[PDB]
A paper describes a structure:
We have used superfolder GFP (sfGFP) as a model system to exemplify and understand mechanism of action of these two different nnPTM routes. H148 plays an important role in defining the fluorescence properties of GFP through the contribution of the imidazole side chain to the charge transfer network that modulates chromophore protonation state equilibrium, and maintaining local structural integrity. We have demonstrated the versatility of genetically encoded phenyl azide chemistry to positively switch protein function through two different non-native PTM events: photolysis and bioorthogonal modification.
The structure of the DBCO modified sfGFP148azF (the first such structure of a SPAAC modified protein to our knowledge) reveals an induced conformation change that drives the functional switch potentially opening up SPAAC bioorthogonal conjugation as an approach for modulating proteins rather than simply labelling them. The triazole ring lies ∼45° to the plane of the aromatic side chain with the octonyl ring puckered to form a boat conformation. The overall structure of sfGFP148azF+1 is similar to the unmodified protein. Linkage of 1 to azF148 through the triazole results in the phenyl side chain rotating by ∼90° around the χ1 dihedral, with the aromatic group remaining in the same plane. The loop housing 148 also shifts to a position similar to that occupied by original sfGFP, regenerating the solvent channel and interaction network through to the chromophore (vide infra).
Residue numbers in the entry: 5 to 64, 68 to 232
Write the structure that this text describes.
C-alpha cells in the first residue's frame, strides 16, 4: 500500500560523535518521489560542525528515488513503509578514519523521519576530514542495490570520491545494509542501481553552520523487451 504520492515533508535528526567531539544536526525539507527530487536544509545545532558537510551527505532517504512505472515491483524502500526500515552503514575513509551509522527511517504522521546515530573512531587531526580540506561539492554515483535473502532486506557498497582542496581525492568506501522494521510485507528487488546527483549550497541568511542540499535520484538498470 506504499504511498509517497504527495510531497511529503522530511525530518532528519542526527546525533554524532567523532574522536570524542559530540555534535547534533537537524534537517528539515520536502521530497517528491514521483519526480525523484528532494530539498533539505541542515543545521548543526551544537555550534560548529567538526567535519566537512560532504562526509555526512550519504548518511543524512532512498524511499524518495524515482522508480519508473515498470520498476515499482523492486522498490524495497517504499514497500517497507510506514513501519520503516533500518539503514546501517560502515564508511571507511582510505588512510583516515571510519564511521558506524545506524539509522531508523519511518513515517510519523504526514512526515518522513530519518533518525541516525553516527560514531566516528580514529581520524587524523590534520587529515582531510578533521582538517576541513574537502571541496564543498559532492559527486554523483550510480549505487548498486542488491537483495539480501537472509536478513530480508537489501545491501549496497560503493566508493565515494570526495575532492580535496589540493587537487587529490579522498576515498570513502561505503558498505550498507537495510532491514525492515516490520515483518511480513516487503519487496525484494533483483539487482538494480540508483543514479543519484546532488547540489550543495548555502542559505544567504542562515547564521548557523548549515548545508542546503538538493538531490535527484532515479532508479534504473532493469530493462525489459
Amino acid at each position: 500500500e506504499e504511498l509517497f504520492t504527495g510531497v511529503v515533508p522530511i525530518l532528519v535528526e542526527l546525533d554524532g560523535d567523532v574522536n570524542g567531539h559530540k555534535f547534533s544536526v537537524r534537517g528539515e525539507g520536502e521530497g517528491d518521489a514521483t519526480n525523484g527530487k528532494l530539498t533539505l536544509k541542515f543545521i548543526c545545532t551544537t555550534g560548529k560542525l567538526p567535519v566537512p558537510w560532504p562526509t555526512l551527505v550519504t548518511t543524512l532517504v532512498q524511499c524518495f528515488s524515482r522508480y519508473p512505472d515498470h520498476m515499482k515491483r523492486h522498490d524495497f524502500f517504499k514497500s517497507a513503509m510506514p513501519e520503516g526500515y533500518v539503514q546501517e552503514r560502515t564508511i571507511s575513509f582510505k588512510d583516515d578514519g571510519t564511521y558506524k551509522t545506524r539509522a531508523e527511517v519511518k513515517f510519523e504522521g504526514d512526515t518522513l523521519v530519518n533518525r541516525i546515530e553516527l560514531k566516528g573512531i580514529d581520524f587524523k587531526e590534520d587529515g582531510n576530514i578533521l582538517g576541513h580540506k574537502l571541496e564543498y561539492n559532492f559527486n554523483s554515483x550510480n549505487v548498486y542495490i542488491t537483495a539480501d535473502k537472509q536478513k530480508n532486506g537489501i545491501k549496497a557498497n560503493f566508493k565515494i570520491r570526495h575532492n580535496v582542496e589540493d587537487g587529490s581525492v579522498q576515498l570513502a568506501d561505503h558498505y550498507q545494509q537495510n532491514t525492515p522494521i516490520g515483518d511480513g510485507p516487503v519487496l525484494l528487488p533483483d539487482n538494480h542501481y540508483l543514479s543519484t546527483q546532488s547540489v550543495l549550497s548555502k542559505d544567504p541568511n542562515e547564521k548557523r553552520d548549515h548545508m542546503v542540499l538538493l538531490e535527484f535520484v532515479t532508479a534504473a538498470g532493469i530493462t525489459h523487451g
